[PDB]
Amino acid sequence: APPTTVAVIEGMATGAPQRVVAQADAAARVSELFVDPQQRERISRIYDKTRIDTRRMAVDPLDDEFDEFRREPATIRDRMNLFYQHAVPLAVDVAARALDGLPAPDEIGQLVFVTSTGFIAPGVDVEIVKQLGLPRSISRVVVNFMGCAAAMNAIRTATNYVRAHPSMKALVVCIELSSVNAVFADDINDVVIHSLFGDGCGALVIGASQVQQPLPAGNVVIRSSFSQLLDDSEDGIVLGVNHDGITCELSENLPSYIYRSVDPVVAEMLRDNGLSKADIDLWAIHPGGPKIIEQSARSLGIPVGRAVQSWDVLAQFGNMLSVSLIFVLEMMVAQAESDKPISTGVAFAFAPGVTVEGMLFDIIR
Amino acid sequence: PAPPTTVAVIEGMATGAPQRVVAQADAAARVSELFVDPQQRERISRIYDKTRIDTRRMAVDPLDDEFDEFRREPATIRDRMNLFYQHAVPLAVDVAARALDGLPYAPDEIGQLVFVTSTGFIAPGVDVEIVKQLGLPRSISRVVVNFMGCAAAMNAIRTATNYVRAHPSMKALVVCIELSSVNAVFADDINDVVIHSLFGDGCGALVIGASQVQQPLPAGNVVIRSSFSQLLDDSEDGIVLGVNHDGITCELSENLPSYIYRSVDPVVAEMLRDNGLSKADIDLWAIHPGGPKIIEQSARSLGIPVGRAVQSWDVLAQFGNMLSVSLIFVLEMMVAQAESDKPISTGVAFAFAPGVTVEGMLFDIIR
Ligand SMILES: CCCCCCCC(=O)O
Ligand SMILES: CCCCCCCC(=O)O
Numbered sequence: 001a002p003p004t005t006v007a008v009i010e011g012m013a014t015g016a017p018q019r020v021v022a023q024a025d026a027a028a029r030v031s032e033l034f035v036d037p038q039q040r041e042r043i044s045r046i047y048d049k050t051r052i053d054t055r056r057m058a059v060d061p062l063d064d065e066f067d068e069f070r071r072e073p074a075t076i077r078d079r080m081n082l083f084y085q086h087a088v089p090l091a092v093d094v095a096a097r098a099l100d101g102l103p104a105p106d107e108i109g110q111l112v113f114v115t116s117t118g119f120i121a122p123g124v125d126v127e128i129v130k131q132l133g134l135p136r137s138i139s140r141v142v143v144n145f146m147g148c149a150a151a152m153n154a155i156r157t158a159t160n161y162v163r164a165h166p167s168m169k170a171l172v173v174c175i176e177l178s179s180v181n182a183v184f185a186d187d188i189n190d191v192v193i194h195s196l197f198g199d200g201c202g203a204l205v206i207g208a209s210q211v212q213q214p215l216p217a218g219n220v221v222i223r224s225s226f227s228q229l230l231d232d233s234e235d236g237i238v239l240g241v242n243h244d245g246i247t248c249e250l251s252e253n254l255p256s257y258i259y260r261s262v263d264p265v266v267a268e269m270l271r272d273n274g275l276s277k278a279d280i281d282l283w284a285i286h287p288g289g290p291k292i293i294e295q296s297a298r299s300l301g302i303p304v305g306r307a308v309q310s311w312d313v314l315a316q317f318g319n320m321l322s323v324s325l326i327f328v329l330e331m332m333v334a335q336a337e338s339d340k341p342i343s344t345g346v347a348f349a350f351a352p353g354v355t356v357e358g359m360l361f362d363i364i365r
Numbered sequence: 366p367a368p369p370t371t372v373a374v375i376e377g378m379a380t381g382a383p384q385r386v387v388a389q390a391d392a393a394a395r396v397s398e399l400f401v402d403p404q405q406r407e408r409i410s411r412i413y414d415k416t417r418i419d420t421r422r423m424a425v426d427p428l429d430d431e432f433d434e435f436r437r438e439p440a441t442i443r444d445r446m447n448l449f450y451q452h453a454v455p456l457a458v459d460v461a462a463r464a465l466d467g468l469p470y471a472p473d474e475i476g477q478l479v480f481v482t483s484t485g486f487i488a489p490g491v492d493v494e495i496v497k498q499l500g501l502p503r504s505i506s507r508v509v510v511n512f513m514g515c516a517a518a519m520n521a522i523r524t525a526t527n528y529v530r531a532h533p534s535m536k537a538l539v540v541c542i543e544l545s546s547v548n549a550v551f552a553d554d555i556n557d558v559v560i561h562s563l564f565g566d567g568c569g570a571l572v573i574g575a576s577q578v579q580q581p582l583p584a585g586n587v588v589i590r591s592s593f594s595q596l597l598d599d600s601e602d603g604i605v606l607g608v609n610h611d612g613i614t615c616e617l618s619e620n621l622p623s624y625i626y627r628s629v630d631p632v633v634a635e636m637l638r639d640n641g642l643s644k645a646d647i648d649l650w651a652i653h654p655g656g657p658k659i660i661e662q663s664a665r666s667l668g669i670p671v672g673r674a675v676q677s678w679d680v681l682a683q684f685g686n687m688l689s690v691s692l693i694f695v696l697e698m699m700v701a702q703a704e705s706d707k708p709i710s711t712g713v714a715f716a717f718a719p720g721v722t723v724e725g726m727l728f729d730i731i732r
Contacts, residue, residue, distance in 0.1 A: 002533055005366045074440050074610030119486065121512040121606040122719035129596055136596045139523055140722070144511035145488045156506055157524060164530040166366040210366045229496055229503045239488035243440030243610040352488035355507070 004211055005166055007159035009220040011205030012330050013097035015090055016056035016198075016317065017179070023052045029062045030191065033184075047195050051290045051311070055198030055318040057179035058086035071184055074243045083118035083180045088127045090201045091175050095128055098171070098203035105132070108205075109168030110139040110161040112154040114322045116147055116239060117176045117246055128173060145239050148286050149349035149357035150174065150322035151202070156225045158206040166208040174322040175201040181245035193248050196289050198318035202326025215364045218333050224360035226269045229353045233257045236354035255295045257354050262299035265356045266346060273360055275344070281337055282345030282363070283307045284328045287314035292350070325349060333363055341365050370578055371533055373526035375587035377572030379463035380694050381456055382422035382565075382684065383546070389418045389562075395428045396558065399551070413562050417657045417678070421565035421685040423546035424452035436550055440610045449485035449547045454494045456568045457542050461495055464538070464570035472499065475572075476535030477506045477528040479521040481689045483514055483606060484543045484613055495540060512606050515653055516716035516724035517541065517689035518569070523592040525573040533575040541689040542568040548612035560615050563656050565685035569693025582731050585700050591640050591727035595632045596720045600624045603721035622662045624721050629666035632723045633713060640727055642711070648704055649712030649730070650674045651695045654681035659717070692716060700730055708732050 027047035034040045059066065059082065069075065099108075111134065113125035125140050139161070146153050151174050158170035178197035185191045206222075209215060230236075236257050238249040251257075270276060277300065285296040287310040297304040305311070309331040313324055320327065325347055337343060343365060348358030393413035397406040425432060425448065435441065465472075478501065480492035492507050506528070513520050518541050525537035545564035552558045573589075576582060597603075603624050605616040618624070637643060644667060652663040654677040664671040672678070676698040680691055687694065692714050704710060710732060715725030 003366070003369045003531060076442060077607055077609050080608055116488075119512060119608045121483075121514065121604070122601055122721075123512065126596065126601070126720050126722075137594055138596075139520075139592075139594055140513075141508070141520055141524055142511060142513055144509055145486060145490065146507070146509055147488065153506070153508055157508055157527075160524075160527040160531045164369060164527045166368055208366055225506075227504050227506055229493060229505075234489055234493070237488070240443055241446055241486045241608055242443050352490070353493055354489075355493075 003163050005163050005208040006211055007162055007206050007222040008209050008215060009204050009222070010207050011098045011101050012326065012333065013094045013203050014327050014330055015094040015201040017058045017086065017090070019057050019060055021055050021057050021060070021062060023047055023050060023054065025062055043191065046191060049290065050195050051314060052196070052318045053315050056200065058177045058199050059179045059182065061179060061182045070182060076241065076243055076245060079180050079245050080118060080120045083177050084120045084123065086177055086180070087118060087124045087175050091124045091128055091173055092131045094201040095132060095171060095173050095203045098205050102205060105134055107167070107169050108134050108138060108171050109165055110141070110158060110170035112141050112143060112157050112170060112172045114143045114150045114154045114172070114174040115176060116145050116150060116321055117178055117181055119144065119241070124175065147237055147239065147351035148288055148319070148321045148324065149351040149355065151325050152225070152347070152349060152357035152359060155204065155206070155222060155359065158204070159222055159225065162206055162208040170206045172204040172206065173201070174326060176321040176323050181247070183244050189249055192250070196319045198320055200317055200320035200323040200327065202323045204326065217364050219364045220329065220333065221362040221364070222359055223362060224269065224273050226265065226358050228261065228265045228356040230257060230261050230356070233354035237350060237352045239352060255291045258292060258295040258350065259299050261356055262296050262348070263301070266300060266348070266358070269358070269360065277302070279344055280346050281340065281343040282332050284325060284332065284345055284347035285310045286349035287311070287324050287328065288319050288350065336365055369530050371530050371575040372578050373529055373573050373589040374576050374582060375571050375589065376574045377464040377467045378693065378697055378700065379460045379570050380697050381460040381568045383424045383452070383456070385423050385426060387421050387423050387427070389413055389416060389420065391428065396552070396561070409558065412558060415657065416562050417681060418563070418685045419682050422567065424544045424566050425546045425549065427546060427549050442608065442610055442612060445547050445612050446485060446487045449544055450487050450490065452544055452547070453485060453491045453542050457491045457495055457540055458498045460568040461538060461540050461570040462499060464572050465499070468572060472501050474536050475501050475505060475538050476532055477508070477525060477537035479508045479510060479524050479537065479539045481510045481517045481521045481539070481541040482543060483512050483517060483688055484545055484548055486511065491542065514604055514606065514718035515655055515686070515688040515691060516718040516722065518692050519592065519714070519716060519724035519726060522571065522573065522589060522726065526589055526592065529573055529575040537573045539571040539573065540568070541693060543688040543690050550611050556616055563686045565687050567684055567687035567690035567694065569690045571693065584731050586731045587696065587700065588729040588731070589726055590729060591636065593632065593636045593725050595628065595723045597624060597628050597723070600721035604717060604719045606719060622658045625659060625662040625717065626666050628721070628723050629663050629715070633667060633715065636727065644669070646711060647713055648707065648710040649699050651692055651699065651712055651714035652677045653716035654678070654691050654695065655686050655717065703732055
């Protein structure tokens with residue numbers, strides 16, 4: 001007999017590096033390194049097509065001082081040291097603020113640490129424990145290279161924890177510093193990647209509640225969680241470690257995989273929870289790029305602009321991989337879409353596989 | 366709400382490793398050749414002898430000159446990760462298939478896959494090929510636990526136990542694979558040679574389900590009673606993992622044995638007390654076979670004779686240090702050869718991760 005308890009987000013917080021990089025300025029830095037004017041207009045037409053206004057970088061890519069370093073080979077170890085150095089102070093602040101809204105450090109039983117842009121042990125999860133004075137006996141899980149949908153896998157892990165240990169809470173911390181892996185382009189993909197990815201941190205505090213028990217406004221109930229590895233999509237999203245930093249490779253066919261897959265997956269899931277698409281008030285589509293939001297919406301047969309919080313996060317921060325969906329959730333909690341006392345929502349994102357990960361959730365108003 | 370009164374059971378287990386055996390004597394010969402001073406070659410042979418390792422398994426033949434060009438060449442990390450994938454998949458899939466072959470054929474009951482490695486980094490990775498080639502459900506929950514060192518199987522089991530305790534109808538599959546051989550480079554200092562003397566290759570897989578407590582279980586099942594974890598202080602240097610241009614690396618402090626001596630007893634003592642036991646109630650000590658000093662200092666801390674941990678010594682001797690995998694090997698041995706007449710054997714497993722952290726389980730083997 002499964003426990004009849006449910007997982008609740010009781011606490012959230014976001015953060016990002018102080019350094020803003022205007023998309024206009026980034027396109028200038030790149031266009032300078034082209035001669036043929038037919039090629040310079042293609043660069044500017046790429047950066048304009050991103051529908052990104054700003055990003056936050058831990059390391060300024062529009063800074064000449066480290067152009068020597070970013071061209072130099074065999075720097076991966078230095079970049080991982082660089083990741084640790086920025087990640088700790090950012091991670092610890094965001095986590096501290098996710099907890100600051102709430103009553104007892106000895107009740108936090110699990111820390112789930114998510115990144116696909118950092119690889120170093122002992123890592124940030126340890127400094128989080130020490131600097132926040134969490135229990136030395138806390139369960140730690142490090143989820144790596146699960147891409148942009150990694151927060152969904154982390155939440156599912158946290159949900160399993162608190163449902164097996166209802167007295168206890170789980171702390172989920174995601175941090176992505178794409179900027180630490182920035183290099184001078186060889187291929188088209190490289191320039192496209194460098195045009196989209198930014199930096200951010202998000203943190204969640206998850207606890208268990210008895211079903212039907214009353215909950216304060218702003219709590220998010222995780223009702224249901226779904227995964228789907230698709231066929232003939234291995235090329236879709238590819239992550240690798242190079243001598244000069246971690247890399248991401250996105251197939252030209254990725255938008256086609258997204259169009260094909262989203263509706264059947266989301267349709268089956270909703271049917272399984274006795275819902276139709278007309279019962280969803282909130283669509284938290286992963287803001288990975290314009291193409292990902294566009295093709296996700298077209299698959300679902302909803303107007304592209306319906307996912308306004310996704311568009312807003314892309315515009316202000318770009319693609320922050322795992323973190324992006326914590327930002328979308330914070331916005332949805334912060335600005336209610338209607339008068340309803342509960343808002344029902346679907347979140348999903350794409351990981352290597354290709355895999356579709358998502359949640360059905362309720363925000364209490 | 367009240368916590369579920371269910372317990373996690375290992376219902377399935379299997380090990381594997383590369384076909385290729387490499388005698389410790391032969392490995393020491395190749396390494397001594399690449400050195401000049403006869404006083405230096407004495408130290409190398411006395412290092413390899415001191416490991417108390419007889420054989421290891423390599424996916425990649427390290428005493429093979431075609432590979433020596435490559436392992437001197439810089440900026441090869443991507444190629445080595447491609448090399449990891451290429452060997453890992455066939456090995457991973459076989460070991461997982463054999464962990465499941467022990468049970469009624471129902472792939473649709475596997476709800477979680479936890480994939481553990483600190484020697485490989487590539488997406489989409491082995492976890493995906495495992496799902497496809499075994500025809501596990503496309504809807505299966507996947508978690509990739511990376512760079513949690515040699516105690517990573519303990520973190521994985523804890524994760525799997527939380528899953529099946531929240532989803533009692535469902536089972537979780539834990540797969541650990543380490544190929545140290547794909548990160549082999551020519552030594553610089555001392556740590557380099559010591560690391561290259563200890564680490565080997567292996568794969569282990571576990572199938573975990575939930576039982577109602579006191580409900581009867583077949584012989585060979587392992588009951589996970591408790592999991593425990595302890596981050597220690599002034600021990601950051603103890604165990605360090607990093608990614609280099611020419612492969613993943615490991616750095617072990619000269620003070621690591623001191624951290625192990627000081628940590629193990631208090632941690633294990635408190636844990637046992639909390640489950641209503643003393644050290645005199647333990648029948649099985651599954652100390653992580655990381656090296657002689659780790660087994661020795663663990664035993665000295667606990668105040669048990671060093672040779673008491675027989676299966677740890679045997680796994681080191683035959684396979685060396687396989688990080689996360691090593692303790693699945695120790696568990697298989699303990700299941701395979703009963704230590705006494707008792708119908709249940711109670712045991713403690715623990716290992717060391719970056720932090721430094723002590724991770725472990727209290728467990729019962731059904732006889
Ligand atoms: C997932 C790691 C890839 C990051 C590449 C650098 C992109 C940028 O920040 O411009
Ligand atoms: C954690 C990775 C360690 C790589 C060292 C290689 C040891 C060997 O295979 O001889």
